[PDB]
Structure formats: structure tokens, C-alpha cells
Design an enzyme around this catalytic site. Sequence first.
Site, PDB file in Angstrom:
ATOM      1  N   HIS B 144       0.874  -1.611   0.238  1.00  0.00           N
ATOM      2  CA  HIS B 144      -0.388   0.320  -0.554  1.00  0.00           C
ATOM      3  C   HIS B 144       0.741   1.182  -0.043  1.00  0.00           C
ATOM      4  CE1 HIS B 144      -3.673  -2.076  -0.504  1.00  0.00           C
ATOM      5  NE2 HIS B 144      -3.095  -2.912   0.378  1.00  0.00           N
ATOM      6  N   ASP B 174      -0.690 -11.472  -1.489  1.00  0.00           N
ATOM      7  CA  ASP B 174      -1.239 -11.521  -0.035  1.00  0.00           C
ATOM      8  C   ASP B 174      -2.486 -11.095   0.631  1.00  0.00           C
ATOM      9  OD1 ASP B 174      -1.607  -8.802  -0.777  1.00  0.00           O
ATOM     10  OD2 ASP B 174       0.136  -7.695   0.104  1.00  0.00           O
ATOM     11  N   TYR B 404      -5.653   3.416  -8.942  1.00  0.00           N
ATOM     12  CA  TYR B 404      -4.027   3.209  -9.403  1.00  0.00           C
ATOM     13  C   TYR B 404      -3.751   2.455  -9.979  1.00  0.00           C
ATOM     14  CZ  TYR B 404      -4.435  -0.030  -4.947  1.00  0.00           C
ATOM     15  OH  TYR B 404      -4.829  -0.785  -4.650  1.00  0.00           O
TER      16      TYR B 404
HETATM   17  N1  LIG Z   1      -8.250  -0.673   9.811  1.00  0.00           N
HETATM   18  C1  LIG Z   1      -8.002  -1.041   8.071  1.00  0.00           C
HETATM   19  N2  LIG Z   1      -9.326  -1.762   7.540  1.00  0.00           N
HETATM   20  C2  LIG Z   1      -8.228  -2.447   6.528  1.00  0.00           C
HETATM   21  C3  LIG Z   1      -7.274  -2.510   6.591  1.00  0.00           C
HETATM   22  C4  LIG Z   1      -5.615  -1.967   7.047  1.00  0.00           C
HETATM   23  O1  LIG Z   1      -4.846  -2.746   7.502  1.00  0.00           O
HETATM   24  N3  LIG Z   1      -6.657  -1.796   8.439  1.00  0.00           N
HETATM   25  N4  LIG Z   1      -6.505  -4.144   4.549  1.00  0.00           N
HETATM   26  C5  LIG Z   1      -7.031  -3.343   3.742  1.00  0.00           C
HETATM   27  C6  LIG Z   1      -6.382  -4.371   2.642  1.00  0.00           C
HETATM   28  S1  LIG Z   1      -4.889  -4.579   2.291  1.00  0.00           S
HETATM   29  C7  LIG Z   1      -7.257  -5.388   2.341  1.00  0.00           C
HETATM   30  S2  LIG Z   1      -6.192  -6.923   1.645  1.00  0.00           S
HETATM   31  C8  LIG Z   1      -8.793  -5.950   3.292  1.00  0.00           C
HETATM   32  C9  LIG Z   1      -8.925  -7.004   4.002  1.00  0.00           C
HETATM   33  O2  LIG Z   1     -10.456  -7.222   3.979  1.00  0.00           O
HETATM   34  P1  LIG Z   1     -10.470  -8.575   4.384  1.00  0.00           P
HETATM   35  O3  LIG Z   1      -9.265  -9.775   4.153  1.00  0.00           O
HETATM   36  O4  LIG Z   1     -11.681  -9.127   4.341  1.00  0.00           O
HETATM   37  O5  LIG Z   1      -9.527  -8.820   6.393  1.00  0.00           O
HETATM   38  P2  LIG Z   1      -9.972 -10.134   6.934  1.00  0.00           P
HETATM   39  O6  LIG Z   1      -9.721 -11.393   5.808  1.00  0.00           O
HETATM   40  O7  LIG Z   1     -11.221 -11.346   7.070  1.00  0.00           O
HETATM   41  O8  LIG Z   1      -9.171 -10.524   7.837  1.00  0.00           O
HETATM   42  C10 LIG Z   1      -9.833 -12.109   8.863  1.00  0.00           C
HETATM   43  C11 LIG Z   1     -11.321 -11.719   9.263  1.00  0.00           C
HETATM   44  O9  LIG Z   1     -11.167 -13.358   9.919  1.00  0.00           O
HETATM   45  C12 LIG Z   1     -10.615 -13.377  10.849  1.00  0.00           C
HETATM   46  N5  LIG Z   1      -9.884 -14.648  10.748  1.00  0.00           N
HETATM   47  C13 LIG Z   1      -9.087 -14.217   9.752  1.00  0.00           C
HETATM   48  N6  LIG Z   1      -8.355 -15.646  10.124  1.00  0.00           N
HETATM   49  C14 LIG Z   1      -9.544 -16.583  10.428  1.00  0.00           C
HETATM   50  C15 LIG Z   1      -9.723 -17.758   9.340  1.00  0.00           C
HETATM   51  O10 LIG Z   1      -8.436 -18.489   8.934  1.00  0.00           O
HETATM   52  N7  LIG Z   1     -10.642 -18.509  10.396  1.00  0.00           N
HETATM   53  C16 LIG Z   1     -11.764 -17.615   9.808  1.00  0.00           C
HETATM   54  N8  LIG Z   1     -12.844 -17.840   9.610  1.00  0.00           N
HETATM   55  N9  LIG Z   1     -11.165 -16.235  10.397  1.00  0.00           N
HETATM   56  C17 LIG Z   1     -10.666 -15.687  10.202  1.00  0.00           C
HETATM   57  C18 LIG Z   1      -9.840 -12.216  11.790  1.00  0.00           C
HETATM   58  O11 LIG Z   1     -11.095 -11.572  13.177  1.00  0.00           O
HETATM   59  C19 LIG Z   1     -10.792 -10.777  11.023  1.00  0.00           C
HETATM   60  O12 LIG Z   1     -12.022  -9.899  11.485  1.00  0.00           O
HETATM   61  O13 LIG Z   1      -8.227  -4.786   4.475  1.00  0.00           O
HETATM   62  C20 LIG Z   1      -8.825  -3.414   3.592  1.00  0.00           C
HETATM   63  N10 LIG Z   1      -8.956  -3.121   5.128  1.00  0.00           N
HETATM   64  N1  LIG Z   2      -0.155 -12.053  10.460  1.00  0.00           N
HETATM   65  C1  LIG Z   2      -0.772 -11.203   9.020  1.00  0.00           C
HETATM   66  N2  LIG Z   2       0.410 -11.262   8.485  1.00  0.00           N
HETATM   67  C2  LIG Z   2      -0.535  -9.875   6.997  1.00  0.00           C
HETATM   68  C3  LIG Z   2      -2.279  -9.999   6.739  1.00  0.00           C
HETATM   69  C4  LIG Z   2      -2.578 -11.053   7.732  1.00  0.00           C
HETATM   70  O1  LIG Z   2      -4.212 -11.123   7.582  1.00  0.00           O
HETATM   71  N3  LIG Z   2      -2.009 -11.672   8.694  1.00  0.00           N
HETATM   72  N4  LIG Z   2      -2.255  -9.684   6.110  1.00  0.00           N
HETATM   73  C5  LIG Z   2      -1.127  -9.634   4.448  1.00  0.00           C
HETATM   74  C6  LIG Z   2      -1.827  -8.740   3.562  1.00  0.00           C
HETATM   75  S1  LIG Z   2      -3.751  -8.429   3.129  1.00  0.00           S
HETATM   76  C7  LIG Z   2      -0.600  -7.351   3.593  1.00  0.00           C
HETATM   77  S2  LIG Z   2      -1.745  -6.261   2.123  1.00  0.00           S
HETATM   78  C8  LIG Z   2       0.638  -7.232   3.530  1.00  0.00           C
HETATM   79  C9  LIG Z   2       0.477  -5.548   3.615  1.00  0.00           C
HETATM   80  O2  LIG Z   2       1.684  -5.668   3.837  1.00  0.00           O
HETATM   81  P1  LIG Z   2       2.620  -4.085   3.216  1.00  0.00           P
HETATM   82  O3  LIG Z   2       4.105  -4.065   2.808  1.00  0.00           O
HETATM   83  O4  LIG Z   2       3.274  -4.203   4.673  1.00  0.00           O
HETATM   84  O5  LIG Z   2       2.258  -2.716   4.542  1.00  0.00           O
HETATM   85  P2  LIG Z   2       1.734  -1.124   4.676  1.00  0.00           P
HETATM   86  O6  LIG Z   2       2.180  -0.786   5.807  1.00  0.00           O
HETATM   87  O7  LIG Z   2       0.721  -0.704   3.722  1.00  0.00           O
HETATM   88  O8  LIG Z   2       3.709  -0.708   3.772  1.00  0.00           O
HETATM   89  C10 LIG Z   2       4.201   0.147   2.424  1.00  0.00           C
HETATM   90  C11 LIG Z   2       5.122   1.248   3.448  1.00  0.00           C
HETATM   91  O9  LIG Z   2       5.323   2.215   2.312  1.00  0.00           O
HETATM   92  C12 LIG Z   2       5.147   3.659   2.810  1.00  0.00           C
HETATM   93  N5  LIG Z   2       4.974   4.385   2.312  1.00  0.00           N
HETATM   94  C13 LIG Z   2       3.327   5.140   1.682  1.00  0.00           C
HETATM   95  N6  LIG Z   2       3.119   5.983   1.370  1.00  0.00           N
HETATM   96  C14 LIG Z   2       3.818   6.015   0.064  1.00  0.00           C
HETATM   97  C15 LIG Z   2       4.913   7.120  -0.508  1.00  0.00           C
HETATM   98  O10 LIG Z   2       3.845   8.071  -0.852  1.00  0.00           O
HETATM   99  N7  LIG Z   2       6.142   7.474  -0.155  1.00  0.00           N
HETATM  100  C16 LIG Z   2       6.934   6.656   0.441  1.00  0.00           C
HETATM  101  N8  LIG Z   2       8.135   6.977   0.095  1.00  0.00           N
HETATM  102  N9  LIG Z   2       6.566   5.271   1.014  1.00  0.00           N
HETATM  103  C17 LIG Z   2       5.699   5.560   0.939  1.00  0.00           C
HETATM  104  C18 LIG Z   2       4.796   3.622   4.196  1.00  0.00           C
HETATM  105  O11 LIG Z   2       5.632   4.164   5.127  1.00  0.00           O
HETATM  106  C19 LIG Z   2       4.745   1.820   4.342  1.00  0.00           C
HETATM  107  O12 LIG Z   2       6.072   1.432   5.342  1.00  0.00           O
HETATM  108  O13 LIG Z   2      -0.051  -7.693   5.480  1.00  0.00           O
HETATM  109  C20 LIG Z   2      -0.063  -8.959   4.818  1.00  0.00           C
HETATM  110  N10 LIG Z   2       0.903  -9.753   5.996  1.00  0.00           N
HETATM  111  O1  LIG Z   3      -1.257  -4.246  -4.563  1.00  0.00           O
HETATM  112  C1  LIG Z   3      -2.323  -5.003  -3.845  1.00  0.00           C
HETATM  113  C2  LIG Z   3      -3.626  -3.761  -4.223  1.00  0.00           C
HETATM  114  C3  LIG Z   3      -5.068  -4.442  -3.680  1.00  0.00           C
HETATM  115  C4  LIG Z   3      -5.239  -4.653  -2.546  1.00  0.00           C
HETATM  116  C5  LIG Z   3      -3.702  -5.772  -1.963  1.00  0.00           C
HETATM  117  O2  LIG Z   3      -3.427  -5.630  -0.856  1.00  0.00           O
HETATM  118  C6  LIG Z   3      -2.780  -5.596  -2.795  1.00  0.00           C
HETATM  119  O3  LIG Z   3      -1.371  -6.494  -2.011  1.00  0.00           O
HETATM  120 MO   LIG Z   4      -4.363  -6.583   1.263  1.00  0.00          MO
END
Ligand SMILES: Nc1nc2c(c(=O)[nH]1)N[C@H]1C(S)=C(S)[C@@H](COP(=O)(O)OP(=O)(O)OC[C@H]3O[C@@H](n4cnc5c(=O)[nH]c(N)nc54)[C@H](O)[C@@H]3O)O[C@H]1N2
Ligand SMILES: Nc1nc2c(c(=O)[nH]1)N[C@H]1C(S)=C(S)[C@@H](COP(=O)(O)OP(=O)(O)OC[C@H]3O[C@@H](n4cnc5c(=O)[nH]c(N)nc54)[C@H](O)[C@@H]3O)O[C@H]1N2
Ligand SMILES: Oc1cccc(O)c1O
Ligand SMILES: [Mo+4]
Lengths: 274, 875
Positions: B144, B174, B404
Site C-alpha cells: 500500500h 497477499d 490507481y
Molecule cells: N482498518 C483497516 N481496514 C483495512 C486494512 C487495514 O490494514 N486496516 N487492510 C485493507 C486491505 S489490504 C485488505 S486486503 C482488506 C482485507 O479485508 P479482509 O481480507 O476481509 O479482512 P479479513 O480478511 O476478513 O481478515 C479476517 C477477519 O477474519 C478473521 N479470520 C482470520 N483468519 C481466519 C480464519 O482462518 N478463519 C476465519 N473463519 N476467520 C478468520 C479475523 O478475526 C478478521 O476479522 O482490508 C482493507 N481494510
Molecule cells: N499475520 C498477518 N500478516 C499479514 C496479513 C494478515 O492477514 N495476517 N495481511 C497481509 C496483506 S493482505 C497485506 S496487503 C500486507 C501489507 O503489507 P505492506 O508492506 O505491509 O503494508 P503497508 O503498511 O501498506 O506498507 C507500505 C510502506 O510504504 C510506505 N509508503 C506509503 N506511501 C508512501 C509514499 O507516498 N511514498 C513513500 N516513499 N513511501 C510510502 C509506508 O510508510 C509503508 O512502510 O500484510 C500481510 N501480512
Molecule cells: O497491490 C494490492 C492492491 C490492492 C489490494 C491488496 O492489498 C494488494 O496487495
Molecule cells: Mo491486502
Amino acid sequence: MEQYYMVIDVAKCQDCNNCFMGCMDEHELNEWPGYTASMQRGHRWMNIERRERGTYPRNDINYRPTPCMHCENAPCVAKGNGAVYQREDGIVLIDPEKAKGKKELLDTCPYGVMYWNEEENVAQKCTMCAHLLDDESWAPKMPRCAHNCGSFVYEFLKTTPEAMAKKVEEEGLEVIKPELGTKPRVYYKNLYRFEKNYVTAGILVQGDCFEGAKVVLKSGGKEVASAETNFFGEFKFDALDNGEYTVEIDADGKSYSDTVVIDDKSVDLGFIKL
Amino acid sequence: MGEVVRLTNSSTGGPVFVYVKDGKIIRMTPMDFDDAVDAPSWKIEARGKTFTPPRKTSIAPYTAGFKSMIYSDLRIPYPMKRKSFDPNGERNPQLRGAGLSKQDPWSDYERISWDEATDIVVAEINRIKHAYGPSAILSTPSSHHMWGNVGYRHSTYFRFMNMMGFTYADHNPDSWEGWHWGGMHMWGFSWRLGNPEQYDLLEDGLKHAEMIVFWSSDPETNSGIYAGFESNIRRQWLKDLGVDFVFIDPHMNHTARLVADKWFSPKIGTDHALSFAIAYTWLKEDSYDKEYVAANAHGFEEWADYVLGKTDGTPKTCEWAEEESGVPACEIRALARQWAKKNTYLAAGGLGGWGGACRASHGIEWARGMIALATMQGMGKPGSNMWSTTQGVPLDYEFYFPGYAEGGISGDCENSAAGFKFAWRMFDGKTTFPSPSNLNTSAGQHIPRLKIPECIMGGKFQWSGKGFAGGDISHQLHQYEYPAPGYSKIKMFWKYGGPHLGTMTATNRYAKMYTHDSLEFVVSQSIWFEGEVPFADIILPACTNFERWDISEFANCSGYIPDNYQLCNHRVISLQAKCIEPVGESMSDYEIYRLFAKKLNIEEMFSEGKDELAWCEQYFNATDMPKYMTWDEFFKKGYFVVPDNPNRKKTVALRWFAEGREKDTPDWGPRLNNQVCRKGLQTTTGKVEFIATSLKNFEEQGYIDEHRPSMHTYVPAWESQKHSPLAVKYPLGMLSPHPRFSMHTMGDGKNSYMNYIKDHRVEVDGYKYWIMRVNSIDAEARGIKNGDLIRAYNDRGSVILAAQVTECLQPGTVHSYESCAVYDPLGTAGKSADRGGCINILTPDRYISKYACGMANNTALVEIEKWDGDKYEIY
Ligand SMILES: Nc1nc2c(c(=O)[nH]1)N[C@H]1C(S)=C(S)[C@@H](COP(=O)(O)OP(=O)(O)OC[C@H]3O[C@@H](n4cnc5c(=O)[nH]c(N)nc54)[C@H](O)[C@@H]3O)O[C@H]1N2
Ligand SMILES: Nc1nc2c(c(=O)[nH]1)N[C@H]1C(S)=C(S)[C@@H](COP(=O)(O)OP(=O)(O)OC[C@H]3O[C@@H](n4cnc5c(=O)[nH]c(N)nc54)[C@H](O)[C@@H]3O)O[C@H]1N2
Ligand SMILES: Oc1cccc(O)c1O
Ligand SMILES: [Mo+4]
Ligand code: SF4
Ligand code: SF4
Ligand code: SF4
Ligand SMILES: [Ca+2]
Ligand SMILES: [Ca+2]
């Protein structure tokens, strides 16, 4: 002489903290001459109380956003020695300057909504963004909490005491600590979620969740509530005051009854195998 | 010196009105519409009521307090250089992160000018390119970014990097793991990386929904993505209509806490046991859409015998499923019976796809289990489908505005979705040109983001697929190697941001890699001094989107999520006004790159003589906006509410498939060649393949992979409580979903206001610790009380956390959000317990399967105890 009132629906709080972030955004880095100095990090002019109830797996949780009650019969105005005043529109404000050097003010609050600012050596608290309410330019014409909500929790209004009194009775609005007689102008809807308790259970018949079982709650022998179990065989009687109750269940002609003690806690009777 | 001015901008938490006075941001708020100039909203008549959205937008928590991030004291002040780093002498790679190892990050660096900083980076770039080639320059941002289409990584980052190097550490899918490496083989949707389309589902649900099963779905918290709290009122509508809501989540998530009618808490990695028991029930009771299945499923007969336990000898009963998951058999069966007889929508994940359940060791079978269930109930017909209530809003799908992901100013047809439509609109092959990469391609060289540490420290690696393999179902099966044939190993690492320690897997390894002597130079181009930044040799300050000019649409990603703006109640296109001058000595990423372009003698080619605002106008003209207003008028207004399209015909997601007719939605697939007469799914048979033909081919070709069988079966999760030997030492099942109060790392830490939120971090003796939720029974058994500092640990590391005793977890299960922005080792970096809260130090780095090269984070076994204060320097 119209006054301001706020209504908070507990049933709708999800604790996303948009309010809280809203004050901070409005008060932490800004100074409002005539109203308040900048807010101190860690203060909770807007304090979102959290309360879990019951036990796994039939537990729940509710939240109570708690700002300043700006009560009509304000204790800190009475015992503030002039450092706190009440406006015609109901807003209760601390004089930013007269209040300096007086940590005693905090104690004049039955609700404990004011916080001591170290850098400013003064008590601070909820101002109901009087600075914003006093400025036509602020199009929303409501505080930052309410405006930042995305959950439709807040209802901000400026009306007559009569109209508000009418609303209170129609919606069954309540206030925190009514017995103290400060008469808050911040009301709560579905306050039972946070202040009261419930009893719940899951009814099974031949090993499967039973739907349509008739459940009745009694206190002193007289029915207090009733319902039929859903497809998960559950029922839930909320808004219960502390005390002893009896639950009676009738499913397929099969009856079951047991007592329940509610003591500031909600009870899960578990699976009832009939 | 002046008055207050209301400006516009946006973010990952929604668009905002920004009040500025004398060069300072006073406040940021949600947007109020002005009915005198903003078009009317859509209306949905359903079950005797008229539903219309609020005349306003909404924002997320981290956006509400975003101002504290802009003026953060952890904001990178100016260009910084590691004191112990000498380009022409001792580079001391072993001293990267030394400050961090002595709990004094900042002391590792000295201030330097932009001119000297860039001169140093440029010297390194040219030396390495002439000695080893551009492939020796590794680089990667992350998933992100600060909101803004022109300045987004798919746009500015790629446009510059493609002209400079480079070896990209392509990102693993991811967000989609389970659906991508698994579901895709079962129903296609490669262009959505496994997720289903969602068009026109809101009205269909309001009219027909009787029940919704939120499985691994927390719409409130996640909002799908980038959509603040736009859908909250929609579930309110459904609720008031009498629709029951059932939540299946180890943790009683925030949506469940608000409107749940019933909650299931399955042990980590056991969801597919429930899906299998629900299917077993439907087969035993003939309670499913046989006609539907007979026409739209492949290999269902064989699958049925498996579910019935004929071939393996284990009938998948609700009792069998209870023993696996801890969820009561009767409840599993009651849900199965209600699901069958009511119009039920499956809300798998918060987006309509996704779901933390998909990126866990059982991720593949969960995803296929969801497709299996929704298939059996005839998804696509009225009142039955996969819908998570966040998308499906009746917005004008015919109006075109780029997300985007479509590439912006890069026009990179292979690493962005520019090839679909934007590239053709943005460039003319006459006056403005794209910036392609002949390295970041399959025939070139890239490495997996999840395995950067191994590539750097090991010097070698072999895996499957390149990044998001959405081209076709089998693209993820292609084999790659590092170093790639003829290419060079990494010598330099140009990092953009530094979140991996809190977002990847078994992250201590990401800290370790920085000191390997093979790494000659590490540059960090970021906004805040946090996470991985204190390991770099040179640090360059970038600014937030509030300090530069950009343009964007509310939650519009597009690309791998075509028309995802349907997550909002209105399509809001806004001008991201430069509200204030860049903070400190930072500058926009584009300006940083322009400076490098100038010193690399490629300025003209890179910038084409345009500044950010210039690129914005050109971007504007390549959309449909000109149909409603000129650039000037738009720039002045600041935002535009796209008018409703009342008369367009509705095309509900998958109905065309349900009805066996030609695809009729606005979806970006399946491609014509993946269909016979444009009917059916992208799969070979055009049906839902319970026995995936693509995987059957893969396994018959010799790629044996026990954890990714061609037939959707109950593959025990390799990191669960009853199937892993590790459970002996680490009995607690931990899931670590996305942070409630932060957009991943963008919100947490940085001394932001979000850190004062009660359920985000808990202050203990001056330090705000990350939270881990523990069921009262497990806390009690360990002498742990609410607020105590605890140590979560396993073979991968230790993390100090503040304990939150709760009932919102089945005993034996613990919960702690991921994405912590603070890496704060108590001892040597990467070898000691972290108190910052980087839970991902504890997640498994093993791939979901031998060939499904995705992250399996949400199934991790840990043990916890009250922290004795030790630093645990044992890793
Ligand atoms: N505030 C906030 N909003 C976000 C984001 C964020 O970092 N912060 N992330 C953004 C991004 S990149 C994405 S990809 C979307 C993610 O959107 P989603 O993928 O819908 O988020 P959840 O995947 O549902 O994460 C899982 C939910 O499922 C439960 N869960 C985790 N593992 C399991 C499992 O194995 N089984 C079951 N039944 N439940 C499980 C957890 O308690 C959690 O509430 O969110 C977006 N929105
Ligand atoms: N245990 C567990 N781990 C997970 C997940 C889960 O459900 N459970 N969710 C997974 C998923 S869906 C995702 S999407 C990843 C998220 O993976 P990401 O790498 O973790 O998360 P971001 O926090 O979006 O990191 C983006 C980085 O870009 C930098 N950045 C943002 N905007 C700008 C800009 O305009 N300019 C510059 N120079 N830098 C910038 C930020 O400061 C930040 O450090 O996490 C994954 N890891
Ligand atoms: O590149 C991406 C774009 C939109 C949602 C997902 O977190 C991702 O990894
Ligand atoms: Mo994601
Ligand atoms: S903003 Fe609304 S839902 Fe959010 S915590 Fe405050 S009252 Fe509750
Ligand atoms: S809540 Fe306290 S501070 Fe507010 S008006 Fe009442 S007594 Fe005074
Ligand atoms: S009314 Fe203003 S001062 Fe009072 S809690 Fe709400 S945001 Fe804060
Ligand atoms: Ca609640
Ligand atoms: Ca059904």
C-alpha cells in the site's frame, strides 16, 4: 432561548474511535482563544467506555461514548468559584484562564470528564466545540464526534426543553447517574446494553437446535419477558436489573425451568438438552 | 496572515475536506455534499421501502487522525546517512541496524544534503550497473501507498525505476493467497486473482436476502478496502428488513460485535471442516440446487463421495467437524439447514473474496470450500450468491475513471493494468510515452517479496509464479529461479518504505538480511523513520499526499479489482490539493525521482517537462471527466460526484453463469479465448471444477504437491493445534488480521493520535504496547491479568505485548493484529524480543504449499506467559 442536546445510540457504537480522533484533530494542535488551550495527549474529553458481558460462546460487548454531559444543574459551575460558567444555550464551559492553577476543579465533577493539562496547568474538557457551534462558517453545525461518525450514533439538535422532553419520552432516552440530579443534556438510547444484563441459552431437542420453543422469564413469579427460540435454539432477555429470575421453557410439550442470579453480570445457561 | 480555506484531498481511509489557515492544516473531515451542485444519489425500491444513501462520504479512524501522521515527530526530517557507512572505504555492512541493537536508532545517522545524498546513490547506481548490470539493483515498495493515482507506486515509482534498473521483488498476492493459488484453479477469475465479481448485488440483496453468512468477514473494520464506513447503513437496512447475520470467525470481530445474530469461533486453520460438514448435510438431506450443480459443476460426483467419506473412510459429519474446530455440531447443522432453505448470501471475506482465512495454512481449502458451498446453493440466481455486503452498489459502471492500479503515468502494461484501457487513453505515441521494463518481466529477473531474505543471504532460490499471476489460471505454475539465467545477484537494495518487519512472515529474517556482506548498498526512500528504515545507508524523505498535487477516486483501485469503487455509496472524484508545503526537508516521490532523472541524464524522458500538476491535467483528460467538466472547473470545485445512471440494465454478478448464458457484466474477464462462445467460467470446462483440471495437469506433469491436491479435500492445516508437532510447545492458536485502527503500518506508531485509542495500544509505564487478546480461561491458567505485559513466543522469536483478557475468542485461541509500524528490539536487531509489537515475527514463513508460494500468516502456533523482563537474545 433554544438549547443544545445530544443523543447517543449505544446499540450503534462500534468503537471505531472516529469521535475521539475528531477531538484530537480539532484540539490537540489547535488553540481556541475564549474556549480552550490545546488538548493534552492522552486526555479523553470524549471517553468511549467499553463493556463486555457474559461468557464465551454467548457473550457480547457494547460501548458508551462519554463526552461532557453539560448538565443543566452543573456541579462545577456551582462549586467552580467562577472558573466555570453556563451559557444560555446549555453549553457548560471552563474559563481557560480563570481555571489555571486549580486542580480542584476536576473533583467538582461527578462524571470525571475533565482532565488536567500539565503544560497549561489547567483543567480541560469537553467544550461541545462551542467555537465551531458559534461560527456560521462551520457548515455542519454540529460537534466533531457527531460529524465524524459513520455509524449514525449521534443526533445533535438545538430545540426547546419541551420538544426535548417529548423526544425523551417517545424514545425512552436516559442519562447517566440520574439520581445525582445534575440533569445531563446528553442522552443515551438503548442504554440497557451498557448498564443492564441478560440471560441466554441454547435449547436442544434430540441433539438438534430447537426452533419455536417458548421461553418465559419471571421475577417473583410474574412474567417479565417471553420469546420463542430462533433456529439456533436461542433466546436472549436483556435489560435485566440485578436480582433473581426463573426461566421456563416449553418445547414439544417438554418443559424445563431453572433459576438465574443476575449480579451486574449476564448469564449463559449453556445448552439445555430436552 | 490570512483566513481559513476549505480544500480537498483523500486517503486510504476516504476523501476529506481540509481546512487550512496560514499554511497550516487545522482539521480534516468527511465530505458533505451540496445538493445545489452535486448530482442526486441512487435509489433502490425493495420490500416496500425506498433505500437511498446519506448525502455524505465517511472516513476511517486512521484518516480521522491522519493529521498527527503529517506532523509526526518521527517524520523523516531530511536526507540522512549512516555514520559507519563509507562509500569509498569501510562500508561496515555488519553495522546496519547497530543503533537499533542498542535501542538508539537515530544515533546511527547524520544529516546530509539532498545534493550529496543523491550524488552518493547515483555513484552506487552507475558503479553497479557497469560492473554487474541493472539487475544487481534490487528494489521494492510494498502493497500500500499514500492515496493519489499519479503519485501511486504503479505510476511514479514504476515510471522512474523502469528507466533506471532494476530487479523487482514482485509482491505475492497477499490479499488473495487462498483464492489466488487455490480458488483460481476451481473457478477461474484470474483477472481478480481468484475473487468473484460483485456487480449490482446490493439491490438483489435488499430484495431477496433472508440471511447472510459472514465467514472470515469484518466489513466494518476492513470496509472491503479504502471505503471508510460506507456500507454500515446498508447492513442496517438489511437488519431492519429481518435478515439474520451469522459470523464465523475465531475472533468476534467488530462487525459481529455490532450486529451479530450468532457467532462461531472455529480453532485456527479449521474452517474447511465446517464447510465440509455443511456440504455433507446438504448431500444427506438433498437440500441443495441439484439442477444448478448438474449443469455448472465438474467432478462433483467424485467430490460428493469424498464428502460422504466413501473413498477415505471418514464421513465429514458436523460431529467430525466439531472435534476439529471446537464449534458445536448442532450449531453447524442448524446453520446448514437454515442456509439451504433461506435466500442466503455467503459473505466470504470483507470484500467478496479475500478474508484473513485465505492467507493461512488452510487458505486454499477455505477458499475452495467457500466456492463449493456457494456453488451448491446456486450462486447467481435471485437470493443466492457470494456477497459480503460491501460491494454491489448501483453506481454508474459505464462511467470511466482509472483506479490507481491502471498505472497512471507509467503505462507499464505488464506490471499495472494500463493495458486494459488507460494506457490507450493516456498516451498517443506522439507527444507522451510510457516507461516499460525489460527486466521486471517473466523472461527477466525478479524475486519473491516473501523470500527476499533468502535470496540475499543465501544467494539463491527457486519458486513458482511471478507476483500477481492474474494473466491466466496456470501462470502461477510457471517456474522461476534466482539469480535468473544470465542475470546478476543483488548488490544494492533501493527500498521504498520499510514495513516488512511487521507485515511479512517470521520477520526476524528481514532484519538479519541487512547485515549480510553481499549487500553493498541500501537506500531507503520513505516518509517516517520507523520499521526497516534504520537499517539503510542513505535515507531520503518523501512527503504525504497532503503536501503534493494529485488526483483520485474514492476507493478506486481497479486493475485486479475492476470497478471496486462500488464499495462506496457514491463515486467521488476529487482533486488532491497540495494543502501545505512539504514538511521539513522532504519532497514528493516524483520530485525525488525527477532529481535522480536529472543526475542520471534522463530528465527529459522521465518528466517530459511536466510537474505533478501537469501530469494531473493530462491524467484528467484521459478519463470521462471532460464529459462533465473541464480541468479548470474541476480544479476549482475540488471534487465531483458522478451522476447516477438510473436507466442502465442491471447485471447481477454470476447470474449469467448461473443461467448458462453469455457473460454480460462489466467484468474484465473471462477473456474471449478462455470461453466457448463467451459462456462459462475461465476454467477449461467452463464450470466449477471440484477436481481442478489445471492442477490435475500440473500434478500429472510431475509437480507433486500434497498440500494442494487437484480435488478440494480436507487437507489438515500444517500449522494448526491438532495437526502440527509444534502444538506441544506452542498450544495456543494465533490469528493476526488487519489492524482496526490503522491502514496496515500507516496509522500505528509515528506518535500519531491513533496510539491513544484504548483498543489499539495500551500504555504501561510510559510505553504504549501492542495488544494481544486472550480468552479469560487461558489468561487465568497463566496467571495473566488484563493489562499485564506478556511475551508471545515460538521458535521464530519473541514479542512483548499488553494482554487484553476477553470472551471474544474460543479458549485456546489468541488474537493480535498485524501491521505494527514499530520495530523496537530489546537486544540485537533480529535476534531478540521485540516490544514494538511486530506479531509477524511469530508467523510461519513456510509457503502455503510446495508450489502455492503465498503467505500463511493467520495460522500460527504460539505460547504466552507474563514477561519476566528478559530481552531473549536467542534468535
Ligand atoms: N482498518 C483497516 N481496514 C483495512 C486494512 C487495514 O490494514 N486496516 N487492510 C485493507 C486491505 S489490504 C485488505 S486486503 C482488506 C482485507 O479485508 P479482509 O481480507 O476481509 O479482512 P479479513 O480478511 O476478513 O481478515 C479476517 C477477519 O477474519 C478473521 N479470520 C482470520 N483468519 C481466519 C480464519 O482462518 N478463519 C476465519 N473463519 N476467520 C478468520 C479475523 O478475526 C478478521 O476479522 O482490508 C482493507 N481494510
Ligand atoms: N499475520 C498477518 N500478516 C499479514 C496479513 C494478515 O492477514 N495476517 N495481511 C497481509 C496483506 S493482505 C497485506 S496487503 C500486507 C501489507 O503489507 P505492506 O508492506 O505491509 O503494508 P503497508 O503498511 O501498506 O506498507 C507500505 C510502506 O510504504 C510506505 N509508503 C506509503 N506511501 C508512501 C509514499 O507516498 N511514498 C513513500 N516513499 N513511501 C510510502 C509506508 O510508510 C509503508 O512502510 O500484510 C500481510 N501480512
Ligand atoms: O497491490 C494490492 C492492491 C490492492 C489490494 C491488496 O492489498 C494488494 O496487495
Ligand atoms: Mo491486502
Ligand atoms: S465514531 Fe460513532 S461508532 Fe465510532 S466510536 Fe464514536 S460513536 Fe462510536
Ligand atoms: S459532566 Fe461534569 S464537567 Fe460536564 S457539566 Fe456536568 S459536572 Fe460539569
Ligand atoms: S463535542 Fe467537540 S469537545 Fe465534546 S467530545 Fe465532541 S468533539 Fe470533543
Ligand atoms: Ca454492541
Ligand atoms: Ca438457500
